[PDB]
Amino acid sequence: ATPHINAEMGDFADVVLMPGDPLRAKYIAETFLEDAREVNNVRGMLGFTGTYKGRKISVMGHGMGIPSCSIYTKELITDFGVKKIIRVGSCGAVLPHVKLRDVVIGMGACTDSKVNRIRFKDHDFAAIADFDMVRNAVDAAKALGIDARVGNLFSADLFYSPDGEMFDVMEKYGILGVEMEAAGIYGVAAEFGAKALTICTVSDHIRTHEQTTAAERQTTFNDMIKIALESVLLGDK
Amino acid sequence: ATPHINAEMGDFADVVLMPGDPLRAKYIAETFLEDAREVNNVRGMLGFTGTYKGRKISVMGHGMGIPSCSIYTKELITDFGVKKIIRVGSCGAVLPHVKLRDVVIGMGACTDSKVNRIRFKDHDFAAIADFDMVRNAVDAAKALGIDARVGNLFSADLFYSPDGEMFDVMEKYGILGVEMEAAGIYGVAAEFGAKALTICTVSDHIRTTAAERQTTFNDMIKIALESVLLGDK
Amino acid sequence: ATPHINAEMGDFADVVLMPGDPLRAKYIAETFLEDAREVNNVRGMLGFTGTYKGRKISVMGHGMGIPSCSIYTKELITDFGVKKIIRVGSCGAVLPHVKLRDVVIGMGACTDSKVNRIRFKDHDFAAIADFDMVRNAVDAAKALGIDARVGNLFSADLFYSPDGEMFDVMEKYGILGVEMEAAGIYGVAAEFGAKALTICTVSDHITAAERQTTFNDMIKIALESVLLGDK
Amino acid sequence: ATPHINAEMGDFADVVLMPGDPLRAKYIAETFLEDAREVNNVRGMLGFTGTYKGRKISVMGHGMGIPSCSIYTKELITDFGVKKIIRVGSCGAVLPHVKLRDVVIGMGACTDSKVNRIRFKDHDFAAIADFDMVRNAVDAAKALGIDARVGNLFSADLFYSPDGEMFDVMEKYGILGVEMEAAGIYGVAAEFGAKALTICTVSDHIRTHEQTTAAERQTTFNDMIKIALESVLLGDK
Amino acid sequence: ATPHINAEMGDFADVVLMPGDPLRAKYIAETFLEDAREVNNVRGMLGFTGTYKGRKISVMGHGMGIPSCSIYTKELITDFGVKKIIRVGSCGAVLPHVKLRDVVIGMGACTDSKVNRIRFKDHDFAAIADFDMVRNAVDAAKALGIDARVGNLFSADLFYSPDGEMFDVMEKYGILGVEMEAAGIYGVAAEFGAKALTICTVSDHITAAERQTTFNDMIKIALESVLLGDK
Amino acid sequence: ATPHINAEMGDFADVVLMPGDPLRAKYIAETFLEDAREVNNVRGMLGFTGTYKGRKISVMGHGMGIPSCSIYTKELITDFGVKKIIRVGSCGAVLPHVKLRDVVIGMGACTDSKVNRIRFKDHDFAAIADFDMVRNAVDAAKALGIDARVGNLFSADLFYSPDGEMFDVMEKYGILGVEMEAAGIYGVAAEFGAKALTICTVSDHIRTTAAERQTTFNDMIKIALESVLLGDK
Numbered sequence A, D: 001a002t003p004h005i006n007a008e009m010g011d012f013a014d015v016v017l018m019p020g021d022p023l024r025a026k027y028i029a030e031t032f033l034e035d036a037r038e039v040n041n042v043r044g045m046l047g048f049t050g051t052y053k054g055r056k057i058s059v060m061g062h063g064m065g066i067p068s069c070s071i072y073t074k075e076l077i078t079d080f081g082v083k084k085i086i087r088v089g090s091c092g093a094v095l096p097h098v099k100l101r102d103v104v105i106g107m108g109a110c111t112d113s114k115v116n117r118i119r120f121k122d123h124d125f126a127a128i129a130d131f132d133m134v135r136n137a138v139d140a141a142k143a144l145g146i147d148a149r150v151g152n153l154f155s156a157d158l159f160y161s162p163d164g165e166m167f168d169v170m171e172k173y174g175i176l177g178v179e180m181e182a183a184g185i186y187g188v189a190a191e192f193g194a195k196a197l198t199i200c201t202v203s204d205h206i207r208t209h210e211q212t213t214a215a216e217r218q219t220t221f222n223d224m225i226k227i228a229l230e231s232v233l234l235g236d237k
Numbered sequence B, F: 001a002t003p004h005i006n007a008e009m010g011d012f013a014d015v016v017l018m019p020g021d022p023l024r025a026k027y028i029a030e031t032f033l034e035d036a037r038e039v040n041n042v043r044g045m046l047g048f049t050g051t052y053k054g055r056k057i058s059v060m061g062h063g064m065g066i067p068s069c070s071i072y073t074k075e076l077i078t079d080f081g082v083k084k085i086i087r088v089g090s091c092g093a094v095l096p097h098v099k100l101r102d103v104v105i106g107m108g109a110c111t112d113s114k115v116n117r118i119r120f121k122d123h124d125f126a127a128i129a130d131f132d133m134v135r136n137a138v139d140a141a142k143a144l145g146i147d148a149r150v151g152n153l154f155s156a157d158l159f160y161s162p163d164g165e166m167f168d169v170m171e172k173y174g175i176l177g178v179e180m181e182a183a184g185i186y187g188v189a190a191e192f193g194a195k196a197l198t199i200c201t202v203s204d205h206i207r208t209t210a211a212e213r214q215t216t217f218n219d220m221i222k223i224a225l226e227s228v229l230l231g232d233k
Numbered sequence C, E: 001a002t003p004h005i006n007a008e009m010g011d012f013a014d015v016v017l018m019p020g021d022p023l024r025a026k027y028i029a030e031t032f033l034e035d036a037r038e039v040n041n042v043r044g045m046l047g048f049t050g051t052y053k054g055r056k057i058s059v060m061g062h063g064m065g066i067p068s069c070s071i072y073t074k075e076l077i078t079d080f081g082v083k084k085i086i087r088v089g090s091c092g093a094v095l096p097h098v099k100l101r102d103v104v105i106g107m108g109a110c111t112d113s114k115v116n117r118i119r120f121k122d123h124d125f126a127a128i129a130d131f132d133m134v135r136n137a138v139d140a141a142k143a144l145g146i147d148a149r150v151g152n153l154f155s156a157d158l159f160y161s162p163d164g165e166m167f168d169v170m171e172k173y174g175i176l177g178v179e180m181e182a183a184g185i186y187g188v189a190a191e192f193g194a195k196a197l198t199i200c201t202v203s204d205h206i207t208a209a210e211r212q213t214t215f216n217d218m219i220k221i222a223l224e225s226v227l228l229g230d231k
């Protein structure tokens, strides 16, 4: 049992999918895993462990923001023997050709957080995913006949940014989606020696329209889940 | 109304207490509020509204971290007409004279996030609470016969800090407690013109029983609710 | 004796009022203190000690800028046993409804100085006053029939800022008045463990009505807050 | 003709390999390309264009440092129609299990340069390579039976760093090699809309021994070149 | 008249010597100038104007800290037609062979102030003196049989630095002396287009031998450098 | 001896002129030096050593950029006993009174690289030239009857700046010329205890014939070589 996770070594698989929303986690456990067993609930952060095609998998929420998922990802890696982390979240689009429900794979993640600067002597640490994991996810996609753009995400500390001019900068450098934890998860993965990948579904467009919470914890967003789960199986081989 | 709260203008009071744990919010509503009804739960972030001694009040969790509590408090201010935000959580102590179970009141909050530099042209913004609100809590604490420290809190971005060095720094400049959102909430308050205050009970020390721990948590909440009554006058 | 204060332990009271102008420390000693006696003159920075309603108090200027007030404040706290520092000065207002002559208590002080980042490992240190001192000042003003504003101040390093766009930012976050030392004094107070407070009278929006009035009111507010503090 | 390149549209291929050393470039043109024709020499920065198995390719040096290769890569992209840039350089190893002549592929590149901060409003821009290009290079390697680690590189402004404690930080976050321009090339690629990849051969070990300039412009360092050239052909398909 | 200088165009010479100590501006007017006349007293910051070997010159203190000297310097340049500013002060030495009483001309000034970054879009602005003024000062000292050291200075914002490890860094890069304003003055000079120079006498390694000597020597060096400048 | 210079202690003079272009170094050696022999070329970075009016002197290119000239100048100081480094290049002008072909002397150099903050604990280090060296060049320029401006240079990391805004800033604070290495070389000089100076001729302006351009380049070099003679005394 860690400060935020009441579980023991073994309750979790070596691989756990992590959405920011705990209710999406329950939905994942219920819709895709077999013999799903709840292993955590300390602050409502639901944790589940079951099997997808024989493969033992776990799925748990990490909350919103980099300092939130940093806590969870860290405890999972250091105290529950977890090896790979695949964040299954949502994000806002800034590029004109990016559509809602489009799946994005972040091989990299920019950020306006100071976390990585704190652990890299105020320099620029490129927050990147695990190449193979990224590739497992690309292959999985092609095999499921689902589209997916591979690129940089931007992990923001402020959902409601006081600086909108930064979206022109993001767009210029073509960041695929705006979310809030990828860059923190990668930094943690690296700091504690683990492997991770962030997959996201465009839930809204910074320049246009959006979805609903309901749609966000159950509708589609099944594509990224299928992709995530299948890519894991690819990694097993 | 918003993607993180499925309530509508009128569902929340103009004063909202905010613990980090969604489960603690249900606990507060259940323990101190009468005729309380759940007003939200889109991400498990339970929110409630009821009345404390005839006063309409709300209680909702903000999750761990500045980025998280920034989304909720911001939405509460601009979308649900909330005027005051009172965070009620816990913190770790760094100074020796500060003991377990102490009720700390953050008049100001230092932080290691770039959130406020981003909104303050990279300069130093002093994230402070609302004066009267701090005072209402101090007075309310005296009435409940419970002494309370007032000072600086440190809002950390990393609960598991790689830079263990900051603790000696924090102690050097005498920050009372260490938590993870005071500076974030104060920043929102300043930006959208609202009032906020965060009270904490010392849960640990860098250097007691549950019945005693739980008694102090309830005191913090009583001080919170009672301060709101004082300000009403 | 210290590099900038030619005096010995005991010469200063545990409480010191500090105007920016050295010429005003003398005025205060003559106008409000009793049995005053000069205790410093090192650089024309006149310091005095006397009593107010029996309470021992000292007065001495700190000069303009954080670096300046920082030298004096530190030396007083670490070498003259001083425990409280009340800065009494002026400031410019940026907000639409903060008027000339108003009184503002700086509960906190924003700054463009790199002084606290150097102290706080380049992190955000909330330079704040001592709450009790804030409340005392607030209570002192109410008794004097004055309505003080309690909020944030902006301690600027450049009186003549290269960019005036920052004044909008300041309004946006409701800073009450623009001055040049509050954040420096608070920084020193936190570093050497002592209590500090800054009270300012709006002298412009970025005579008798000033002196025998507002300025005098602010000094009365300060001195009376000390007594309340002693309670 | 650009300020630093005396050539015209067409003299260069859409793909050009770029080592920091102009003499290594001549060596590449001479050893691997056919009908090699010199297209530049303004400040000794030799430029060559020929063919590798029918494919028209160019190879030119970019000098040492981020501000140097920034000039060249920029002019190439904006004035000579270049689309893909593959840096073929050398680097120092900081990890104990990294050996001289080991080939490294940088999917990411950390840096202590301020360049990306200047173009990203003082935030953290993840300097990453083009995924497909990275994968072309991985596949090429497996096909040539050559080993290659994929990861983060660190682009340094100071070869002789006044801060050696930063190597512990680099090593901790497992950066594969220390070089001096990857992060600048990626930033330019993104700022001007082009695709790029950085391949490096460990020329020395920060904690141990090193090679010679001669070995650096001709010996081995053929592996990365073969990998680079072949991966391009893969990308053509 | 300006916020901190109660005078009108014409009251100051196009050249102004500036000690940190206001009390020393008066000493210089009496000891070296001729037909001096007070031109300011706003905050005890005494300013004087007279002539040296027929050359019109003014003397006035700037106070401690960059913020301080920055207010005066700017007002002099933009409102009183001043074209040259020579700072004459003291500093502490960190280098092993820079001795007490030595004279150092700051060709450049390092700083921990955020003042120029605010001016230079957070980039590195080389706060430098006017070369001619440096050379004039250097030539002036040689004639006076004095061997001045020309190099870098470090303008510190905190007299009492929270970390003393920086003093090693300073030695490593050979800074000649530690003071508190040179980089601020240079910044203002560059911003409003004017020439500035800082001359310091080593007063410590971080009496008659000081006054009627070193301090007097430095003032002689300064005044004579002006005349050479006029050539 | 080193991975960027294949010479040995004795191959270089204690004073080295450094243009950015390796080809320009060969041009200087060929045009002003007698009995000059090539002392290096590992990356095409030609280096030469000969004598100017009986004085032993070297000329070697440093490539474009601070990171590049930092490697060479550093190696020259610590590995080949070099005492003085005199960069001789070109720059762009930003101020109107500064005309094409002006010979600028950088007494100081502003920069936008983190190189010096890295070595100066993130504080402001004033990258300046050696005083006497600046003076020797000023005197030598008068003798050659050529006026010369002395002031600040700006060492840019990005020749193609995305932030076009800096030019007005540079002009505001009156920096004479814009190049790419002065601050880098000065930083090395300070760090390894050596002396350096960079002279530039204005090649362009942000707002003439080759024979005239080439005449001014030679003047710069003559001023460089002649300044070295003055200092020798």
Ligand SMILES: Nc1ncnc2c1ccn2[C@@H]1O[C@H](CO)[C@@H](O)[C@H]1O
Binding pocket: A020, A063, A064, A065, A089, A090, A091, A092, A093, A156, A158, A159, A178, A179, A180, A181, A203, A204, A206, B003
């Ligand atoms: N437009 C946006 N800006 C910022 N974050 C966004 C979006 C859209 C989705 N998310 C992600 O969902 C949570 C906050 O809504 C966060 O956990 C975040 O990853």
Ligand SMILES: Nc1ncnc2c1ccn2[C@@H]1O[C@H](CO)[C@@H](O)[C@H]1O
Binding pocket: B020, B063, B064, B065, B089, B090, B091, B092, B093, B156, B159, B178, B179, B180, B181, B203, B204
């Ligand atoms: N010692 C500590 N360091 C950091 N955060 C701490 C503590 C102690 C309590 N908290 C609070 O609890 C939540 C994260 O555990 C956070 O919401 C935070 O307020």
Ligand SMILES: Nc1ncnc2c1ccn2[C@@H]1O[C@H](CO)[C@@H](O)[C@H]1O
Binding pocket: C020, C063, C064, C065, C089, C090, C091, C092, C093, C156, C159, C178, C179, C180, C181, C203, C204, C206, E003
């Ligand atoms: N409008 C303003 N901007 C900046 N400082 C101001 C004002 C008004 C008053 N002060 C105070 O006076 C000194 C500098 O003039 C400073 O010490 C400061 O306390």
Ligand SMILES: Nc1ncnc2c1ccn2[C@@H]1O[C@H](CO)[C@@H](O)[C@H]1O
Binding pocket: D020, D063, D064, D065, D089, D090, D091, D092, D093, D156, D158, D159, D178, D179, D180, D181, D203, D204, D206, F003
């Ligand atoms: N140990 C090291 N530290 C820094 N750069 C290194 C090495 C080793 C090789 N390189 C690369 O080669 C050039 C400088 O030697 C540069 O262009 C650089 O990419």
Ligand SMILES: Nc1ncnc2c1ccn2[C@@H]1O[C@H](CO)[C@@H](O)[C@H]1O
Binding pocket: C003, E020, E063, E064, E065, E089, E090, E091, E092, E093, E156, E159, E178, E179, E180, E181, E203, E204, E206
């Ligand atoms: N050792 C030191 N450290 C810092 N400042 C010093 C010295 C020595 C002299 N000064 C000068 O005196 C004023 C501050 O004491 C400042 O204005 C400064 O010019």
Ligand SMILES: Nc1ncnc2c1ccn2[C@@H]1O[C@H](CO)[C@@H](O)[C@H]1O
Binding pocket: F020, F063, F064, F065, F089, F090, F091, F092, F093, F156, F159, F178, F179, F180, F181, F203, F204
């Ligand atoms: N306008 C400019 N901006 C930047 N660098 C410039 C110029 C003009 C000349 N230089 C110098 O030439 C080289 C890069 O072209 C560099 O080595 C540099 O010294």
